[PDB]
Motif scaffolding. Structure first.
Motif, PDB file in Angstrom:
ATOM      1  N   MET A  90       0.846  -1.089  -0.112  1.00 15.76           N
ATOM      2  CA  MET A  90      -0.059   0.256   0.028  1.00 15.76           C
ATOM      3  C   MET A  90       0.813   1.335  -0.050  1.00 15.76           C
ATOM      4  SD  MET A  90      -3.108  -1.329   2.237  1.00 15.76           S
ATOM      5  CE  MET A  90      -2.307  -1.978   3.438  1.00 15.76           C
ATOM      6  N   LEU A  91       2.097   1.247  -0.093  1.00 11.15           N
ATOM      7  CA  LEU A  91       3.143   2.317  -0.278  1.00 11.15           C
ATOM      8  C   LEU A  91       3.301   2.655  -1.628  1.00 11.15           C
ATOM      9  CD1 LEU A  91       5.748   1.628   2.497  1.00 11.15           C
ATOM     10  CD2 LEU A  91       4.142   3.589   2.500  1.00 11.15           C
ATOM     11  N   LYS A 107      -3.801   8.309  -4.275  1.00 10.03           N
ATOM     12  CA  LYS A 107      -4.694   8.171  -2.825  1.00 10.03           C
ATOM     13  C   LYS A 107      -4.564   6.935  -2.359  1.00 10.03           C
ATOM     14  CE  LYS A 107      -9.342   9.255  -1.459  1.00 10.03           C
ATOM     15  NZ  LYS A 107     -10.630   8.912  -1.472  1.00 10.03           N
ATOM     16  N   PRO A 108      -4.250   6.808  -0.902  1.00 13.89           N
ATOM     17  CA  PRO A 108      -3.890   5.600  -0.517  1.00 13.89           C
ATOM     18  C   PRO A 108      -5.109   4.657  -0.226  1.00 13.89           C
ATOM     19  CG  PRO A 108      -3.100   7.320   1.392  1.00 13.89           C
ATOM     20  CD  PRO A 108      -3.792   7.912  -0.075  1.00 13.89           C
TER      21      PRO A 108
ATOM     22  N   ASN B 112       2.534   5.615   6.775  1.00  9.95           N
ATOM     23  CA  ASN B 112       3.878   5.628   7.307  1.00  9.95           C
ATOM     24  C   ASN B 112       3.858   4.202   7.629  1.00  9.95           C
ATOM     25  OD1 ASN B 112       2.833   4.903  10.070  1.00  9.95           O
ATOM     26  ND2 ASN B 112       1.952   7.120  10.334  1.00  9.95           N
ATOM     27  N   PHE B 113       5.087   3.843   7.922  1.00  6.31           N
ATOM     28  CA  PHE B 113       5.685   2.468   8.194  1.00  6.31           C
ATOM     29  C   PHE B 113       6.959   2.788   9.027  1.00  6.31           C
ATOM     30  CE2 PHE B 113       7.856  -1.571   6.804  1.00  6.31           C
ATOM     31  CZ  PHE B 113       6.923  -2.385   7.381  1.00  6.31           C
ATOM     32  N   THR B 189       0.345   2.070   8.757  1.00 10.33           N
ATOM     33  CA  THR B 189      -0.635   2.961   8.867  1.00 10.33           C
ATOM     34  C   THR B 189      -0.800   3.750   7.717  1.00 10.33           C
ATOM     35  OG1 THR B 189      -0.292   3.308  11.347  1.00 10.33           O
ATOM     36  CG2 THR B 189      -1.990   4.450  10.535  1.00 10.33           C
ATOM     37  N   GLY B 190      -2.049   3.675   6.883  1.00  4.17           N
ATOM     38  CA  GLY B 190      -2.210   4.310   5.479  1.00  4.17           C
ATOM     39  C   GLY B 190      -3.284   5.306   5.615  1.00  4.17           C
ATOM     40  N   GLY B 191      -3.082   6.168   4.697  1.00  2.52           N
ATOM     41  CA  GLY B 191      -4.329   7.316   4.553  1.00  2.52           C
ATOM     42  C   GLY B 191      -3.502   8.383   4.415  1.00  2.52           C
ATOM     43  N   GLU B 192      -4.508   9.656   3.887  1.00  5.53           N
ATOM     44  CA  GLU B 192      -3.912  10.859   3.344  1.00  5.53           C
ATOM     45  C   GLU B 192      -3.675  11.723   4.570  1.00  5.53           C
ATOM     46  OE1 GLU B 192      -6.738  11.998   0.358  1.00  5.53           O
ATOM     47  OE2 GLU B 192      -8.240  10.904   1.209  1.00  5.53           O
TER      48      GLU B 192
END
Ligand SMILES: [Cl-]
Ligand SMILES: [Cl-]
Ligand SMILES: [Cl-]
Ligand SMILES: [Cl-]
Ligand SMILES: [Cl-]
Lengths: 262, 260, 255, 266, 252
Positions: A90-91, A107-108, B112-113, B189-192
């Motif tokens: 997902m990156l 967009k993620p 972020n990761f 954790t994913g999202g704008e």
């Protein structure tokens, strides 16, 4: 089954279980078809490739009984290590995804997600519940039979075994807490348009499958059943359309031999 | 194979290091950042530039030589780790998009990761692709000859994290079917609009012992540390976005263990 | 070095924040944020830069030596309810609405040690030109945006070391305990707890707390609560004081 | 409801299982599990909500086996509730984003169920004791609902007049009543309220989670007149129709309660 | 004076949100903002205040004193926020009412004497209205720590929440707990259960000791902002229940 003592013997089995998100063409393995919306519950006919399904696999084990004697031996599941595989994928915000804004990145994946696994000595037992009892489900799916309005809350007629991979839509079925005496299941549902996926990986985390009496699921017919659903959220294409994205789940199960009364 | 902890003079040691992040470093002044993200319209034509791809960090730490009936090996018992420079993100006065007129710059935020591993051998990795048709650039090591299956689980994509600044974070995860001799920990954790949340303290220790009280055993007296700390996206004046990463500190306590 | 516990004392301190104090009425606030378009030209004004707070608390000179050993700390951010003032000076959330709450990036940090806090420099932008009165990484390079081991400093001056330039150094501080949480983002809600029932034990694995070298105890903090948005949409850091109550005992050490 | 004698004797265990349906309003025969669309009045002085728009507490009384052959003995036996396993049923039905829902944007999927939610259960040996509190004491509640009687402005904070047993299914509006922490000596209750229009529902299922119902003295709820009382409210959030109207969505709650036989003084 | 070692008291403590008329008990006056700190004169009914009550205990009288051992506490009426049909702004066209949300503060204290408070101000130049007790002779230092501003929570509905915190340098004979959550869209998250007990004993096993046979309960439960049809915002607060278990302790 009268359960006697542990034999003192052990084995580990493992499985990478693929997700069943719909797979709308040969390149979109792990994704659903684009989400379409029908304006009314009265005419709701979802396409099969748009519906994520529960994943399941049967792991065969060798029979333990030299003779079947007053006591038999069964494999007993003690612990499971499990994790979702490919969370860093997902990156990739550089392909196929709608820009967050002009000059910005893709967009993620975000939105409604569901992360579920089970380990049992028999297929997962499921209870049907529908958002819309009048939905017309497509050929290849197994969904609640003769649903009524009560099917939107709790209709005890909707009992099923998770007995087929890629057939039982996640939206129609939940693990049945009134059954599954011989399985352990764990799930979290998080709903909403903008929900961030939060996923953890570690090889230090072990789930113990033993009940209050110290007994794990027992492989009655020398098979172990693993079950999963890992909908990570929605991918938003350049065009604005949305598709589910799922990831495979790894299982590593420690088994031991348990004596039981014939 | 594992016998007693060996105590005595010099049966304990501690090693430390700072592992720099590998975010892409698009020019000589932007160490710790990626190149700006670009989006191609379709999976069929996805050709990320090398400097846009954050990669896993890794280093081998030598340990005092031990003699090769029982083998002696260093056993990693604990790790203290934290991300270094978290307060640098309080610079909202430089090169960042204005949150609004008369306003300060936009904080780093978004996907972020945060990941680390400690092992007695290189971290073992499993490949998974968002898009199996991605064309990855020279200088990267990515899943070889991928298929549609490569978007879910293809067991051919096995690698050791055997090179720093080479294995893109988006292509590889730690392999839970291997790493018998390593411990790894990660949160995606994913999202704008995801806010970075990062803790520092010199009082927190991770115990690396398994259920039998055995930590990672260091083959050829080498300890392997791995990390990825993508903190989120930096938003430049024009609205372009770049990954920002930070270094990770490790302090590892080890003991001598008799084996086999 | 460290022998038996020998002889109790408590010290307490309210440590003011150093948020920049742009004029004598705006104590606890920074100057409004300004943004320069590019990293090549970044010259922040001193009053715009929150700095670490620190105090040295002298202890009775007890001189095999005896040293004061810090055993426990109780600490609390003071005035968290002041952020319920949405009637003074803040942007209206919408027409007919009340003022906009303090929110956004925040950092909550404290330390107790027997010597000055050891800090490691890390910069967003190595080419930043910091103003007179600040102490920032000397001879920075691109590597100063990640880890550059040259940037080592003692927190030895109050209101001088900008929070954005410095972190506690995990490779040192053998004689101190530190704790911080950074939360970044435009709309981050402040979340702050008060209780007089929480104690942090400062003893290490061997039951030894920080030992006061030269009979001094060092307290350090940074409590940036978020951004205050004024009527016109300008943004300023807001900070709060931190309370410390530290229990010390006498420890014998080798001469 | 199934009542299963797991063991007989002095160490008798009875397991009680039941699925309690939600009571969200059920505005038409096809929208079982939903409320009527929410309507907003401009002012507190003219607030007259419709019956089918108001979610209510769910409750049932489960009769248990008679324990006492001789009613005249110095000691009698009571069923004591020692554990409960509970979970919300059908949480995955919220993954249907294809039926009747507002698109998130042009060409996007349906809007998920989201917003204010309340998840609550209780297990007791008598009816749940409730305290009334109103948003607006001047609300006119509809026929078929049971709501605080002769409320005053003090009914918007604490008015000790508003005491009630949860003694009728689909009648006590969730918005008017909470469990009373000054009573309920013979019940255990657990609830979480999360408010806001964008709140994501977060729901967990597992058959490994047990709640112990014993108090500090090792005593569970005691079933008076051989009666076990289950209560619930599971408002998951709001469903947004294509039109933009919003309706409450509720889900059934499962209970598995383990009971033992306790000797008490007659 | 504490030597060696039962009764239960209970209270519903009402919130003091401002109560701008006879019908809006539990709410504040609508929020107004002045453009500058130099001219900040909030109206009394706009200002939530700390709640407190003195609870008389049986007289016992080398001496004996009531010691508070445990508290159970709960915010009362949390489900009242499921009324989205009455006086609230619509979230979009044809949508339901906007939930109560934004900045909140949930606080309680149990003590054997009044709660000791420390003053801190967002804006030292605020002019506070008659009927409020606020920091005296405030300065710019009142925006950070000014040790002049000590008070006892000695009056119900007088000490504005925005002016005062519990003083961690005092309160030797009380236990307090609070959480502040700031921001425009913060969701209220509130739990009820009758299975949760807070132990009030210090590390030495001593609870608050009730001076003059008096127990003091203190609270602030600002749940968030209610947004009316026009876009105006008002604080909403709820009552807090306390059940305190006390035992007799021999003192001197
Ligand atoms: Cl069926
Ligand atoms: Cl490969
Ligand atoms: Cl330097
Ligand atoms: Cl009533
Ligand atoms: Cl004062």
């Amino acid at each position: 089954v009268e359960v006697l003592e542990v034999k003192t013997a052990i084995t580990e089995v493992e499985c990478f279980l693929n997700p069943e998100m719909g797979d709308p063409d040969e390149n979109l393995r792990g994704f659903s078809l684009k989400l379409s919306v029908q304006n009314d519950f009265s005419s709701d006919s979802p396409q099969r490739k748009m519906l994520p399904c529960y994943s399941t696999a049967r792991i065969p084990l060798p029979n333990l009984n030299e003779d079947l004697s007053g006591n038999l031996l069964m494999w007993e599941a003690v612990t499971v290590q499990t994790e979702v595989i490919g969370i860093t994928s997902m990156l990739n915000l550089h392909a196929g995804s709608q820009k967050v804004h002009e000059h910005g990145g893709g967009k993620p994946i975000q939105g409604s997600n569901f992360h579920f696994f089970a380990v049992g000595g028999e297929p997962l037992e499921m209870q049907g519940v529908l958002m819309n009892y009048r939905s017309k489900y497509p050929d290849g799916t197994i969904t609640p039979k003769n649903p009524t309005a009560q099917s939107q809350v709790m209709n005890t007629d909707h009992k099923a075994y998770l007995d087929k991979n890629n057939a039982y839509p996640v939206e129609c079925w939940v693990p049945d807490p009134s059954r599954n005496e011989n399985a352990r299941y764990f799930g979290t549902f998080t709903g909403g348009e903008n929900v961030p996926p939060v996923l953890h990986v570690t090889n230090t985390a072990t789930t113990v499958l033993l009940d209050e009496q110290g007994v794990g699921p027992l492989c009655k017919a020398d098979s172990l059943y693993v079950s999963a659903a890992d909908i990570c959220g929605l991918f938003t294409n350049s065009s604005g359309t949305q598709q589910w994205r799922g990831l495979a789940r790894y299982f590593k199960i420690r088994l031991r031999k348990r004596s039981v009364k014939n």
